[PDB]
Curated annotation (Swiss-Prot), chains A, B:
Single biological process term from Gene Ontology: carbohydrate metabolic process
Protein name, as recorded: Protein O-GlcNAcase
Binding site for a protein: G8, K39, D115, Y160, W219, D220, N221, D226, N254
GH84 domain location: 1-277
pH dependence: Optimum pH is 7.4-7.6.
Function: Cleaves GlcNAc from O-glycosylated proteins. Can use p-nitrophenyl-beta-GlcNAc and 4-methylumbelliferone-GlcNAc as substrate (in vitro).
Pfam families associated with the record: NAGidase (PF07555)
Amino acid sequence: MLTGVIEGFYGRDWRRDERATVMDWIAAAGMNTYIYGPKDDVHVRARWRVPYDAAGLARLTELRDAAAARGMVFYVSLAPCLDVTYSDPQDRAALLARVDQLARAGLRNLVLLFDDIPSVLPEADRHRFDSFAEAQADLSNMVLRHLRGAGHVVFCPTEYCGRMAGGDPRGSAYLQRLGSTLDPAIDIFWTGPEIVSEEIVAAHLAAVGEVLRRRPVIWDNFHANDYDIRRVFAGPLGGRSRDILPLVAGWITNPNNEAEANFPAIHTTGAYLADPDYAPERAIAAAVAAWQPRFRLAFGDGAVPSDLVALLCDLFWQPFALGPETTRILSALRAALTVPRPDPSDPAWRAALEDLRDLKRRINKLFTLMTEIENRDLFHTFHNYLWEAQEEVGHLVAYCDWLDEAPPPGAVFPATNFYRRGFGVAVQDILQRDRQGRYHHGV
Amino acid sequence: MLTGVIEGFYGRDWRRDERATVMDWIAAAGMNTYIYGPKDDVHVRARWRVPYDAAGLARLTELRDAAAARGMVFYVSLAPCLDVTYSDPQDRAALLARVDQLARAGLRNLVLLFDDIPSVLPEADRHRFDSFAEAQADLSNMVLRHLRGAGHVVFCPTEYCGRMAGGDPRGSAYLQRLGSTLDPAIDIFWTGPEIVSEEIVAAHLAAVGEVLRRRPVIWDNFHANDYDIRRVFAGPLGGRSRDILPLVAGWITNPNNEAEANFPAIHTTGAYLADPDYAPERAIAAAVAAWQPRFRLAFGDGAVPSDLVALLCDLFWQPFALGPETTRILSALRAALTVPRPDPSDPAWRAALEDLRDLKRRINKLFTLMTEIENRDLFHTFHNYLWEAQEEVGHLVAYCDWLDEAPPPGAVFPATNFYRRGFGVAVQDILQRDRQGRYHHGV
Ligand SMILES: [Cl-]
Ligand SMILES: [Cl-]
């Protein structure tokens, strides 16, 4: 089974030391694959016809050797999809020359990406190929046949999730033609019913396997989506049962473009793949214990305490869920805010308010400690998210402190995809602002 | 400030390796004192007039040297209270000979215990001393004066908690006389308003200091009471604010007679004494992280996972509280058991029941893993408590599984100090048994 990480994002690519770090994490998680395809690298996609110069090729061979030393197979990406004429001898030759340059260097493991195509097939292709599917498969088979039995090919389809495929993937003309034309030795990426899938279920993957005529390699965007750079997810992998593993040929985690964000994603995904009894809250506890040394404070032996690293995960948990600890604190608050004016002597209101004030104290401590850690990149990764978390809990405690002083009914607080969730969203959910500018809690 | 542990319990005394282990823990917690007084040692109390033989004395000198190497001061106990004639030249001489034997050996730090006395003063004393207080103080001053400025004395009073002193400690004739007769250089132990105090508060300790005419050394029985061997507390120190520390002269933790039970007691007490921001749930998280290596599994590198060590603490938390995680799980169950027949489709009942089944799974895993650890004494310490926890959660899940199958109203489940709390008690609290033998949940 092919398992690991794809470096495929926009923005700065990873430094050599960052790539080493992430590879160590992949190896320790019991995974076995690193795929290289950064948007930073002009050769992968934007100018895919242009072979690497001598130095670039050498950078790739050294990465391979670095992954090999760790027990990992190294793949190189090629994305000849934006402006290819699939039948054109010159374009076919250009793709084969890319493949040949890599293969001769001993880079024989390739990913061919077709996720961004024109609306209509080029009329140079239309009499020879009946579809994009037929065209992409022929071009990819050509690559496979060139490698002469040494090397492996993974294909990223144009329709790579259920919504793009039209719902039921068996209903897609593209996928139907792809499954019957693409050589069986070529693997195919799949992200689930959506680009970022809340759940990936057995029945769904059975349908995918039917139409692809093979089990897919999962390309999981749960922790990161190349086209959503405003989010960080440090919680455990969730929404995928162990019972789907006999239905897949691999598991490739899409990483956050910030290297340091990815520790729990990789650690818990590793646990999911290896352990029959995987349970997300137990897995995240294990990841917090292993992650904590990276939180060493500058100029000392101490580190951010475990309880506060666990809070970091809880606050920035999953795309469709706040972490369990902060969810319960906010839910107990909602349940005491069923009345317009909470009774300050009420035990339930009092309990809910103390756990909120305590949550603010712990966020404030975590925020301050993070500014003081030795690993400055880890600090930068979480700073703005923690800044916003701090401001939001600040506003909510201020609001509830005001309700606790028992204001008159008429007084107002003095100023200064729907499955998706987060701390910021959950706070505003409770503390709303009406058309007049007035904060309230939905009476 | 005098801080650390007193080995004063009944049953087997600690082995040499056990004493070393506990001393390491005391040193790492930033504490500085070890007090030796086991019930096993016939010389301490039962036959207090009898000096040690050569070998016993040497065992004590080696313990001192062992504590010294770790940055700890070693004390020896003497309890000449059960059958002493305070005025008797022979008994005075016998006590001074004990003190002299220890002092000459370089054991100059003594605890004098008066916690178990006759109902009435001996009539040989009654004309010369007006009270037990006056008598005990004279005898203790004598010990102090014998040490000639090198050495320190701590006094355990007959009335050592507020209930024994009659409520307000300033109201006690014994304490009033003790405070004005006992040399000011002698410290005095105090356990709080009760033998095992739920809270120790500032106002209370201000009163104690008034009548004792000195700040007391706290003898805290929070985690263990020599006369309650059916209990284990692996949660954090709670119920004592940092604001009481300027009101005390010391902090001596009473340990569980099982050495391995004491890791979190000592770790969190250390944190309480050192950190202005002490918070019990954060402290217990730190203790779980430091404790976990002791849970290495036999024949391997792995250990019991952190989440399950944390569960061990949560289940066996404090004398007046179940841990927070299990408290919430049981409280959500109570709130869904407000009806005689829970509706199986009800979301609230469903959530409560799944968290209970999950709690059973995790207890079962913890129980089994504990049987497999390398440190067999750690296993023995918790085995019977975990056995009972497992049986109790077993019965409760069985009961709730039966309610989930929606039985008719009339059907019955087929068989097979009030602040105090525990997992077992909390479970029976919910799942009761009426005068006919029928289990129910208080409709
Ligand atoms: Cl810690
Ligand atoms: Cl762990």
